[PDB]
């Protein structure tokens, strides 16, 4: 592993220092349908004219980005995305901007969000959960080795591809950082205690979030929930977790070590780093090399009927893309 990661860090660094810009333009794509909306922008299914390929195009209204003070975050998202390269990471193909918007064109993952399948089916069996978990583990091992923190793990940001494997999307809150950071950002149910308590945090938060994900997948609901975010923070800070009867002994053991309020004891943040997790009982039957190579038998494979099929995504109110005649926020987004 240390042999492989070393080569990855090199390609990453070259692109991190000298990012690509303006690799396409709006008129090369035919907008088809919205695949999803977010606190920030919308993602549409588009078709590239010259090639005929489908892509998912994320659209960001510059003015909205500014109002919400997400300038630096948007710049991180684009800079990081265009530099990373991993099997379980969504791939950025092109990126550009016009007078009103910022655009990121990625590979289209037609399998739908893990969110929809998880909520339709109820919950995933442990072997099923483990399959997904393993992919996130390797993914976090890659990201963290480059000094990156994800900060927004959740089923809504995980896509299922044609082979049944995961593709992590949305690097909205991703940040390259050595040492600690302080931004209060993420989704309430997934926030680590360090965040809520405003004490400065590191990579460790991603590991806690993995704990919430695994729990949500196996139980069918998150470990901490309520009707208002404030009530949720109280639960997370107390550290009181209750497990479903059907949860195996091994799973409960892993979880207790990931949902550990004391970041000096939290798995992933100890001396052996990612190995405490990989070597844990719950993952004993997991062949790590097999999953990285995608040679494993996917437990669930979504049904898609040809290219362009959006049947695995919910329908959304279509909204017309507006391009002002005047350039908006030119200086702020120069490097984009």
């Amino acid at each position: 592993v240390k042999e492989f990661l070393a080569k990855a860090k090199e390609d990453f660094l070259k692109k991190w220092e000298t990012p690509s810009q303006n690799t396409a333009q709006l008129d090369q794509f035919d907008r088809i349908k919205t695949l999803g909306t977010g606190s920030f922008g919308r993602v549409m299914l588009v078709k590239h004219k010259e090639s005929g390929n489908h892509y998912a195009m994320k659209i960001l209204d510059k003015q909205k980005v500014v109002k919400l003070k997400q300038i630096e975050h948007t710049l991180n998202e684009k800079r990081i995305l265009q530099a990373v390269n991993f099997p379980f990471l969504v791939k950025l193909e092109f990126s550009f901007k016009d007078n009103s918007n910022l655009y990121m064109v990625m590979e289209y993952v037609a399998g739908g969000e893990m969110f929809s399948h998880l909520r339709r089916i109820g919950r995933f069996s442990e072997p099923h959960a483990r399959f997904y978990a393993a992919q996130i583990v390797l993914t976090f091992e890659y990201l963290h080795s480059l000094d990156l923190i994800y900060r927004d793990l959740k089923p809504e940001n995980l896509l299922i591809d044609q082979q049944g494997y995961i593709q992590v999307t949305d690097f909205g809150f991703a940040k390259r950082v050595k040492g600690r950071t302080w931004t209060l950002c993420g989704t309430p149910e997934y926030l680590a205690p360090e965040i809520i308590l405003s004490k400065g945090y590191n990579k460790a938060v991603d590991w806690w979030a993995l704990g919430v994900l695994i729990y949500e997948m196996a139980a069918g609901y998150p470990p901490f929930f309520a009707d208002q975010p404030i009530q949720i923070y109280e639960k997370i800070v107390s550290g009181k977790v209750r497990f479903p009867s059907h949860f195996s002994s091994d799973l409960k053991d892993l979880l207790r070590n990931l949902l550990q309020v004391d970041l000096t004891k939290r798995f992933g943040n100890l001396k052996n780093g990612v190995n405490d997790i990989k070597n844990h009982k719950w993952f004993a039957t997991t062949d790590w090399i097999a999953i990285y190579q995608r040679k494993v038998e996917a437990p669930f494979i979504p049904k898609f009927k040809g290219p362009g099929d959006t049947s695995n995504f919910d329908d959304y109110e279509e909204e017309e893309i507006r391009v002002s005649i005047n350039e908006k926020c030119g200086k702020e987004f120069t490097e984009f």
Binding site: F115, T183, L184, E189, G220, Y221, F225
Partner: peptide, 20 residues
């Protein structure tokens, strides 16, 4: 049950981020 309490809460749909 916990499941019934979850399904009755107002947070079963797509959850949005919280920011600075």
């Amino acid at each position: 049950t916990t499941y019934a309490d979850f399904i009755a809460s107002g947070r079963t749909g797509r959850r949005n981020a919280i920011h600075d």
